[PDB]
């Protein structure tokens, strides 16, 4: 790989520079290189990996949605025929998005998850696995759509089981996992009631635990709780 000749510490340093420069494709490439050194990632390094790929895939998802909307409008009655170009370009962006998801899933499978023994690392990686299968599911339309959805579900469910046994209800990883699994239920699995129930139980059980936290931890937890609330407000 192109990062094979660069020191691990230099890749981490450059990932942080890339973040400051808003160069998220570079950041992701540096972090992929760091993962491929074969050592486990620290908490800070896991969050660099996550931030990098979430920005890359986020731009692709936003572009895909724009193009898919244009493509859908073109297929309405009365719309003038414009040729294959919209479909082709949507497919191009889709294929690149799927490639990024496959890259992330590949890092998780080789070998981040299997080496992750602490609850914080294992939940973090399983949540990421669910997220990137969810992004695959957002664009899926073929024979394997059900299996992609079930792969997301299974990863989230394993992460949830560990998080509930091993982390307090205010832990920000646990909260973000529950937030994302609730989005999965609402937007992927056609299960809005499950989404709402999960968001409300998560919020309430975190509320009840805030009293145990320092001011700084309280801020971290309440930020994600507000996102749960925002979704509940959208959905109800």
């Amino acid at each position: 790989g192109a990062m094979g000749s660069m020191e691990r510490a230099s890749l981490i340093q450059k990932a942080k520079l890339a973040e400051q420069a808003e160069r998220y494709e570079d950041m992701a490439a540096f972090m992929k290189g760091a993962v491929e050194k074969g050592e486990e990632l620290s908490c800070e390094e896991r969050n660099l990996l996550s931030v990098a790929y979430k920005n890359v895939v986020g731009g692709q998802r936003a572009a895909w949605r724009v193009l898919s909307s244009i493509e859908q409008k073109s297929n309405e009655e009365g719309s003038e025929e414009k040729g294959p170009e919209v479909r082709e370009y949507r497919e191009k962006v889709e294929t690149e998005l799927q490639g990024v998801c496959d890259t992330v899933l590949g890092l998780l499978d080789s070998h981040l998850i299997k080496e992750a023994g602490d609850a914080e690392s294992r939940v973090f990686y399983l949540k990421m696995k669910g997220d990137y299968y969810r992004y695959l599911a957002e664009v899926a339309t073929g024979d394997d759509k059900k299996r992609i959805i079930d792969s997301a579900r299974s990863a989230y469910q394993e992460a949830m089981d560990i998080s509930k046994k091993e982390m307090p209800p205010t832990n920000p990883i646990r909260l973000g996992l529950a937030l994302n699994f609730s989005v999965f239920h609402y937007e992927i699995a056609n299960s809005p009631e499950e989404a709402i129930s999960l968001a409300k139980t998560t919020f309430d059980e975190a509320m009840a635990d805030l009293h145990t936290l320092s001011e700084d931890s309280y801020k971290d937890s309440t930020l994600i709780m507000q996102l749960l609330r925002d979704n509940l407000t959208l959905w109800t």
């Binding site: 973040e19 908490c43 660099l48 931030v51 973000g176 937030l179 989005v183 609402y186 937007e187 979704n231």
Partner: peptide
């Protein structure tokens, strides 16, 4: 809907 994520940096 809102999904999770901020940078520690």
């Amino acid at each position: 809907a809102h999904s999770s994520x901020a940078s520690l940096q």
